[PDB]
């Protein structure tokens, strides 16, 4: 399982290895002799185009809406208590209307879905237009998440919990830098791996590696300090 | 003390040498799909006996060079004096 696999890819390493690259265009090119239906259907590669700002914004909005609906399903609705009269009226609606459960679900999940969509879209636009080209990635993520979650906690939940929102945003930013923008459990390269370029003979490479080993010996404390017994 | 002590290493730019010559080879492998497409287009154009003058092995090459340079140029520019070092 990997998070944000496409962004954290070593294009040079995959190219030298021949491994397929996630940066390939992934586009359809219908032929000029193809049918009109085929030409119309080949337009779906737009839905895959990733440089599409509006597509990405709607993608983030859908993710946020799904998260909000899941939260409502799990914790929010069950924690919130509905008035007895309201419950009786909606049950009567279910009795008097076919598929009344669907409409009740729509009514109950509209607030969570809408707020999740808004949060997702705003968060995507925020992160992409701002903080995308900062120098310190960790600091940028921490500050952006802190501010965004501070505002979100102030608005959605309560203006009196904005400090806790900011702290949670800092924590979430650290977590995101750790496991979303970085590959700690998603390694696709062996540690110490490298690639060779230029016309160097194997003898020269072995000589250089011997010199590197001689330098590496100095890392050991005993040899550096000359504190070894005569074996 | 930062910037007050000696520098450990000198780059090609610090020594006054051009690194793009090698950096092109370095960045070649990642732009393999476009290189393969350009090769296939060149092969087809060579095979063609009566080729329309409009046909040319140019646009695939344009895409390939664009992809190569998108990676080659920023690496060199970030190492130049006068710009905030990455």
């Amino acid at each position: 399982m990997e998070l944000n696999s496409s962004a954290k890819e070593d294009s040079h390493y995959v190219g030298v290895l021949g491994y397929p690259s996630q940066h390939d265009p992934h586009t359809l090119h219908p032929k000029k002799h193809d049918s009109t239906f085929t030409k119309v259907y080949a337009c779906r590669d737009m839905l895959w185009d990733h440089h599409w700002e509006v597509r990405n914004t709607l993608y983030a909005g859908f993710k946020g809406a799904l998260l909000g609906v899941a939260y409502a399903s799990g914790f929010g609705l069950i924690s919130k208590t509905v008035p007895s009269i309201v419950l009786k009226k909606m049950f009567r609606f279910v009795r008097n209307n076919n598929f009344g459960h669907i409409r009740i679900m729509q009514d109950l999940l509209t607030p969570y879905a809408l707020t999740g969509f808004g949060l997702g879209s705003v968060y995507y636009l925020y992160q992409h237009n701002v903080w995308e080209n900062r120098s310190n990635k960790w600091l940028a993520e921490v500050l952006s998440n802190a501010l965004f979650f501070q505002v979100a906690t102030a608005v959605c939940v309560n203006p009196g919990f904005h400090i806790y929102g900011m702290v949670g945003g800092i924590l979430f930013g650290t977590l995101k830098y750790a496991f979303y923008n970085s590959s700690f459990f998603q390694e696709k390269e062996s540690i110490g791996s490298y690639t060779t370029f230029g016309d160097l003979s194997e003898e020269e490479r072995k000589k250089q590696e011997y010199k590197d080993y001689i330098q590496f010996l100095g890392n050991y404390h005993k040899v550096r300090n000359g504190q070894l017994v005569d074996l | 003390m930062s910037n007050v002590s000696d520098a450990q290493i000198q780059e090609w730019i610090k020594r006054g040498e051009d690194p793009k010559e090698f950096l092109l080879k370095e960045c070649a492998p990642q732009c393999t799909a476009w290189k393969e497409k350009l090769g296939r287009c060149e092969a087809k154009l060579k095979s063609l006996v009566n080729a329309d003058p409009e046909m040319s092995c140019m646009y695939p090459l344009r895409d390939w060079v664009t992809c190569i340079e998108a990676c080659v140029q920023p690496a060199i520019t970030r190492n130049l004096f006068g710009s905030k070092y990455m």
Partner: peptide, 30 residues
């Protein structure tokens, strides 16, 4: 409304299709 990214026209601005123009601004950030 949607402008293909491999035609050689940036954001739908046709022309300049025999040049390398996306380097440093759209593909790569000098």
């Amino acid at each position: 409304f949607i402008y293909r990214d491999d035609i050689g026209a940036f954001w739908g601005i046709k022309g300049y299709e025999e040049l390398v123009t996306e380097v440093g601004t759209h593909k790569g950030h000098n």
